[PDB]
Design a binder for these strands. Structure first.
Ligand SMILES: [Ca+2]
Ligand SMILES: [Ca+2]
Ligand SMILES: [Ca+2]
Ligand SMILES: [Ca+2]
Lengths: 480, 480
DNA sequence: TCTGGCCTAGATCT
DNA sequence: CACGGTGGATCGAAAA
DNA sequence: TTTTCGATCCACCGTGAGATCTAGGCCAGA
DNA sequence: TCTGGCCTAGATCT
DNA sequence: CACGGTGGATCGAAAA
DNA sequence: TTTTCGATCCACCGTGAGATCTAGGCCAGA
């Protein structure tokens, strides 16, 4: 009978990102201020945590890894979803279907601990698998949808491991997860049996190369084609599609960074205009024109292209992407590239990120007309894997993965969770053991995406909408 | 007339490390819980901040740097100190004297912003100057002392700059600061004129090499001697001391890390036992015995020596230092080094870190007997600069800097503030400009060490005491 | 019969 | 021995 | 009899992050 | 009159 | 258009 | 008349970080 609810207390706890001691200090000092009641003790909020946590039968924490069985998280998370429905019984008493997306990531530059010398690699680099429910329908009848399908707040962990990314472990855990998905059953809740269909789409093309039968990463995994032969419409329109590889849905993240890098590469090569920078002087010309365009781009648009000495081109990620697209005329003047074509890239990126249904005939029309205008303008550079996958293969996988609007299917949401992971591991863990820290990060991320608390917790929305482009809204199949 | 005081509200704000929006959300949700009063608005707490902030006449924030005049912070901070006295008038109505320590640091691996291309270096590496009051006395009559002279909570900023460490800027800002110290006046407060004596001791020997007239860093800056000639007692006991170089007081931080590294170097060289690892096979012997001792040290003491690829030997910092010293018999057995000598190193490190007065005759006795036992045991390795400065020069600078108990004079406190700096710059800044972020970090660190709030704010003390060593407490001049 | 010049390569502390 | 911290397991003791 | 609630301890964690003289080789060398 | 072998150096995406 | 955020300047309007 | 207090917007920031096939040279070459 205190002022706050224990569910509201746990939601505020994780919304403010407070610690246990921090909470006892706040509560004891507020009682010291003289209001006899103000909060539940941490005992009550850990009892509320005990409502969020999956059964011990399916959790597995170790010194060096942890996992959970898939079905157990589906049953738990959909149980938590039934209370989010305004009345889980006043819905029609029929089977429902959860369409979910899942995937995984390797992230590096992790803090190294001084404990538990345990043989495997130490703690060099994190690798985690994760899942998120997008949509519940009974024949298209949306009973629940994520209000923010792109927020990290809804990504739920399936496993994590302190191992660097490698095609070996990548294929092993992929095929094992696929088997576990085939070995899953519709969940049950108080007389409701709900099917679950999963899409392994929350994955970068950079791992899809391992999940595809292409030795190169520069070969389009949907084409199985070389960059030289990539520049033709007909031969790739006359190529078959590999087995279920549309499950590798459109990775909206890398497409934009690859667009930025390929357009900068072209801006460098406007001197000699050959795909490869191999040749005579073209290296010195590249060095010169790259430095010149970095300085004339910085002085007018106030950005610095980031530096890496272990090796990597840049981190343009999100902000350089959107800033580069905010007024494309700016880079069109500085680099001297056509503004129409970057407006087409804006149109398609906006259509992909909108999060709504897209008419595939108009999309395929604009994509092939963009391929036309590209090759007639800049042929000599072989377009990257992702921009070819966009122009030729995109409409096909859009029509395949049309059961959910694209942009809700994304990895940007899940890989942003690594931001939480590090901050979870540093603040909210108990550091007396690696196994303890692994239990901490497990339960902390399960609370971080407890759907009911994720519904009733603090958030900020003032970023509601922004100016869509005219050819985009022509392309946009927007209804409401 | 709300429940919390605005000073208590600001102290809780910065104790919990909350944001402005986080505070409005907490307060509005707590009013939404129905207790009509609970906190002052952020308006009240920014008015309380306006009490902490130094006058605009002496602050200087820029796009790329910021500073404050020294006298202005002394006058402000001692003004804040007068309220910490139980009754600033019931003290004897006489002049007081603040003995303070100060210094600076360069720290790297800083987050790079995408804004304000401003010419100088970008934001590659931070360099900040800082000060802290230790002690107020009127002829030894302690009227105030820091209860925790080693906590970062009392370090106060004097300037900061986005420039990498370099002997040039180091000497320029050193000499300028020294001039500004000579150009300072005793503060005034409501009929009390208080003198201020500063010690530039919060600095590593690694910068003291620039502040000393020694081209080498491996040459002892107090000796001005070579490592070969460093191994003699008499010739260095017969060497004069440079001008005021005792102001470069005992850097307790690097002494312990250098002890760890030099003892590991000796553990490697137990095969051939020559100072330099130059020679025939000694390289292969070093590689082998280093790997072997890393593995036999890890498997029993559960530690991993950290890796650096830009270049650096290790980061043993604090935890590897104290863990290595907790049961020295462990490393004595694994490396095969004498336990007595590492017990002597423990005794002297414990005496330095105790924070209390030390009898210099007994200290000089034990230090020269440690030099004897070292050279008779391990002569062939030339002891490092810092361990020589300890054994020969330490008692001299202890008797010089005896006006304050050593260990309160330290840099570990100030350089831990870089932990706050990064976390201050990422969370609590406003990111609309570099100049805005520099104002944020300025005022945030001034609040982080507002002495009155630093007194009345949450903290944790259960780490009160631990087992001193017997020869130490023999050496320890401990009274109370 | 053994000090100096050149350097110099490769150890040295963050 | 720098020190301000890290959540869970447990004691125990007092409410309930 | 069970719940709750504070205290307690556990085994560490983050903050210390580009240039250098000098030990020695060698080479002559009368 | 123009495909293959060797490689190979130097572009390629994080 | 990812989204959860960043303190100050200002409006305004309601206490005081 | 001044203070206070919520809302608001500003111009962005952190989270995406070691191995590769293939384009082309060349070299012969009957
Ligand atoms: Ca990643
Ligand atoms: Ca990746
Ligand atoms: Ca530093
Ligand atoms: Ca240093």
């Amino acid at each position: 009978s205190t002022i706050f609810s224990p569910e509201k207390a746990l939601g505020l706890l994780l919304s403010l990102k407070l610690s246990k001691w921090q909470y006892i200090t706040l509560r004891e000092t507020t009682i010291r201020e003289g209001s006899k009641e103000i909060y539940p003790s941490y005992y009550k909020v850990q009892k509320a945590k005990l409502q969020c946590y999956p059964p011990k039968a399916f959790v597995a924490v170790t010194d060096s890894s942890a996992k959970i069985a898939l079905q157990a998280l589906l049953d738990l998370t959909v149980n938590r979803i039934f209370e989010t429905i305004r009345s889980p019984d006043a819905i029609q008493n029929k089977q429902l279907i959860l369409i979910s997306k899942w995937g995984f990531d390797g992230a590096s530059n992790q803090s190294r601990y001084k404990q538990n010398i345990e043989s495997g690699q130490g703690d060099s680099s994190i690798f985690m698998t994760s899942l998120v429910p997008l949509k519940l329908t009974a024949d298209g009848d949306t009973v629940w949808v994520n209000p923010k399908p792109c927020s990290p707040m809804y990504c739920r962990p399936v496993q994590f491991s302190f191992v660097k990314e490698t095609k070996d472990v990548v294929i092993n855990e992929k095929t094992a997860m696929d088997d576990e998905i085939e070995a899953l059953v519709p969940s049950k809740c108080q007389g409701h049996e709900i099917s679950h269909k999963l899409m392994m789409t929350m994955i970068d093309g950079k791992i899809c190369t391992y999940l595809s039968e292409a030795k190169s990463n520069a070969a389009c995994y949907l084409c199985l084609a070389k960059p030289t032969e990539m520049s033709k419409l007909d031969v790739i329109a006359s190529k078959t599609i590999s087995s279920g590889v549309y499950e590798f849905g459109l990775s909206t993240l890398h497409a934009r960074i690859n667009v930025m890098e390929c357009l900068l590469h072209i801006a460098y090569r406007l001197d000699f205009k050959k795909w490869s920078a191999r040749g005579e002087g073209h290296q010195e010309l590249l060095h010169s024109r790259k430095k010149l365009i970095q300085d004339r781009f910085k002085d007018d648009l106030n950005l610095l292209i980031d530096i890496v000495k272990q090796g990597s081109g840049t981190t343009n990620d999100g902000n350089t992407a959107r800033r580069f697209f905010e007024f494309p005329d700016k880079t069109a003047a500085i680099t001297g590239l056509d503004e129409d074509l970057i407006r087409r890239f804006s149109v398609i990126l906006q259509a992909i990120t909108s999060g709504e249904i897209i008419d595939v005939p108009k999309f395929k029309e604009y994509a092939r007309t963009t391929a036309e205008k590209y090759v007639e303008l800049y042929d000599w550079y072989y377009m990257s894997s992702t921009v070819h996958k966009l122009l030729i293969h995109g409409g096909d996988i859009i029509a395949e993965n049309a059961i959910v609007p694209i942009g809700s299917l994304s990895e940007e949401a899940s890989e942003a969770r690594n931001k939480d992971f590090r901050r979870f591991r540093e603040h909210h863990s108990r550091k007396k053991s690696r196994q303890a820290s692994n239990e901490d990060i497990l339960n902390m991320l399960i609370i971080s995406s407890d759907p009911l608390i994720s519904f009733t917790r603090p958030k900020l929305d003032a970023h509601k909408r922004q100016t869509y482009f005219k050819e985009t809204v022509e392309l946009l199949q927007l209804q409401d």
